[PDB]
């Protein structure tokens, strides 16, 4: 399997209601393993998966120091962004950042990421070469100039190719029982009349990990992309995920429809039909 580590930072200002909130969460694939919340009674980097708990005091102290320093940096960045966009001090704004590394099945670095947003829109991104930037507008070009002058990309490149990959590999070994286990979907097809001459077929996938899945309906072997209702993949709360796909079909034509399921936990793709 290919594997990734990602951190997600959110800093949200709230004029009149104190300093901006900073929350950081870290993931390996679809498994959260740490969190930090500046609004907690005692803000600390905290474990959120059982395999990270074995890390020692130096780990938790160092991560807490880093995330507290990041909270202060992003509070300043929100003030800076107000200047760059000529905005008043009256409104609430949000900075987001996601970064991390992807490994191939080899276990070697496939690519690194470090991307940031302001109020939900792209702001600046580290390019795939890990040495240049893509700025979304003339405000972000000001940041780009600063980061070029300060050699920020070189530092990020050193992290992404070095500690990021090293520590992801460590987590994958320590957590191998779960992080390196794919749970295939449990699948079934339900049937419910809409009316006398149409019925809904719904193809269900439950209990699977990781979240990536493809569920498709075919009629007479042709994909029904436009006529298929596909819900967002959703978490069950026990590490696994759920999804369904539905089509409305003419009564009497149900056996012309097949549901196809692809998932890493499956040796080969599954084909199912409604079984009356």
């Amino acid at each position: 399997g290919s594997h990734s580590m990602r951190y997600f930072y959110t800093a949200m200002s709230r004029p009149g209601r104190g300093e901006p909130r900073f929350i950081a969460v870290g993931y390996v694939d679809d498994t959260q393993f740490v969190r930090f919340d500046s609004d907690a009674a005692s803000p600390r980097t905290e474990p959120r998966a059982p395999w990270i708990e074995q890390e020692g005091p130096e780990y938790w102290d160092g991560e807490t120091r880093n995330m507290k320093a990041s909270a202060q940096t992003y509070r300043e960045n929100l003030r800076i962004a107000l200047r760059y966009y000529n905005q008043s001090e009256a409104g609430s704004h949000i900075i987001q950042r996601m970064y991390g590394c992807d490994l191939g099945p080899d276990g070697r670095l496939l690519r690194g990421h470090d991307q940031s947003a302001y109020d939900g829109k792209d702001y600046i991104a580290l390019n795939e070469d890990l040495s240049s930037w893509t700025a979304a507008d003339t405000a972000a070009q000001i940041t780009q100039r600063k980061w070029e002058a300060a050699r920020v990309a070189e530092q990020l490149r050193a992290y992404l190719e070095g500690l990021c990959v090293e520590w992801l590999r460590r987590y994958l070994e320590n957590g191998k029982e779960t992080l390196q286990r794919a749970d295939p979907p449990k699948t079934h097809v339900t049937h419910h009349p809409v009316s006398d001459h149409e019925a809904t077929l719904r193809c269900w996938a439950l209990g699977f990990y990781p979240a990536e899945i493809t569920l498709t309906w075919q009629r007479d072997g042709e994909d029904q992309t436009q006529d298929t209702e596909l819900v967002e993949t959703r978490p069950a709360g026990d590490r696994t995920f759920q999804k369904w796909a539905a089509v409305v079909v003419p009564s009497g034509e149900e056996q012309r429809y097949t549901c196809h399921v692809q998932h890493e936990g499956l040796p080969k793709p599954l084909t199912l039909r409604w079984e009356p």
């Binding site: 880093n66 940031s116 530092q155």
Partner: peptide
């Protein structure tokens, strides 16, 4: 393990 790099805008 998180990134230590300071990213001031």
């Amino acid at each position: 393990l998180s990134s230590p790099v300071t990213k001031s805008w």
